Amino acid sequence: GPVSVANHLGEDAGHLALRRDVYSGLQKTPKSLPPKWFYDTVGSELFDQITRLPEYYPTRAEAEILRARSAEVASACRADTLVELGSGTSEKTRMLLDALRHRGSLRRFVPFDVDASVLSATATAIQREYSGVEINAVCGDFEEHLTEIPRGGRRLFVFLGSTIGNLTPGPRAQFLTALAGVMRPGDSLLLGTDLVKDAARLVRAYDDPGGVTAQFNRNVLAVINRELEADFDVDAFQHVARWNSAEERIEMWLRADGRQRVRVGALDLTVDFDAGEEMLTEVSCKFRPQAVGAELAAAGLHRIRWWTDEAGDFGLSLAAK
Numbered sequence: 001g002p003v004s005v006a007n008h009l010g011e012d013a014g015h016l017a018l019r020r021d022v023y024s025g026l027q028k029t030p031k032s033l034p035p036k037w038f039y040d041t042v043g044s045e046l047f048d049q050i051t052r053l054p055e056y057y058p059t060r061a062e063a064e065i066l067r068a069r070s071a072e073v074a075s076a077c078r079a080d081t082l083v084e085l086g087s088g089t090s091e092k093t094r095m096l097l098d099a100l101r102h103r104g105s106l107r108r109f110v111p112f113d114v115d116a117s118v119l120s121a122t123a124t125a126i127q128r129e130y131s132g133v134e135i136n137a138v139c140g141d142f143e144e145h146l147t148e149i150p151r152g153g154r155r156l157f158v159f160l161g162s163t164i165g166n167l168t169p170g171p172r173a174q175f176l177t178a179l180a181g182v183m184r185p186g187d188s189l190l191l192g193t194d195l196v197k198d199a200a201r202l203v204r205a206y207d208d209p210g211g212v213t214a215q216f217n218r219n220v221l222a223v224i225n226r227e228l229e230a231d232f233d234v235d236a237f238q239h240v241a242r243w244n245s246a247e248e249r250i251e252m253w254l255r256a257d258g259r260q261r262v263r264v265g266a267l268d269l270t271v272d273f274d275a276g277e278e279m280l281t282e283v284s285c286k287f288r289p290q291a292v293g294a295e296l297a298a299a300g301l302h303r304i305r306w307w308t309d310e311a312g313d314f315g316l317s318l319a320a321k
């Protein structure tokens, strides 16, 4: 099938975005950094390890559902084009394409991410594996370029992994209204949401006894040190995984053991860390079944399917425009 990549990000947009996030994020109280910056090369290898950890259930909880329900997703959505808000490198991607292909209605795959190299490998993969499929990879980000996604016949947008949990309720509702707006009648959105559960089970999923999440979390300091000429005594920052009972969300913090002071060279900046001061690096909001349909209805979408794994740990929503 025909391949195409459209690149809406300038050659520097990545490093430019990094430069302002840590510049602004290190001057907040408390200091905070978006979780997008975890995922350099060693960060992605660390995450793929995380998905294989016994304690990290969401990855396998969502694959359990998708293995069982993919033909339903297809027959409900009846979509000829699968739009992935992600890299397209997972096996869940394949299960969704297989379902659409089995239905007989698969024409077009649209991977949508901010890394053209990943989009290209993905585009080659899907081209070698699915003759007949047009791959129209789009390289952009959500706030500006969701409008650049092609139209096709009838579109299944897919945002899995409970990645939507990284948006607190403000940006979450804003992200969904805008995604609802680029959607048109007949299109649907397939949404993965990790569910509220035993707080011990939640914290343990982000502080594995093996420490793989710990080095994954402090890898954002390794990224800032490398890409921006900084001097984080990375080991002096302790991994902290918190359950926030009032907000119902996991939080990953890096706690500074003793007073620290750090200079970020590319930004001519120096920031201080009090002894025991924490810096927020990721939020995973945990969800409730009807509250997810509610949020989808407030974005202008209407849920028509809900599914969980055998234990009720993870949920997948299907929502029509």
Ligand SMILES: Cc1cncc2cccc(S(=O)(=O)N3CCCN(C(=O)CN)C[C@@H]3C)c12
Pocket (backbone or CB within 6 Å): 035, 036, 039, 047, 085, 086, 087, 112, 113, 114, 161, 162, 163, 165, 166, 284
């Ligand atoms: C989904 C996605 C969409 N668009 C751009 C992306 C750019 C880089 C990485 C991903 S991502 O796929 O690597 N992503 C990241 C956030 C944490 N996530 C959690 O689940 C936390 N509990 C989910 C999952 C690991 C992107």
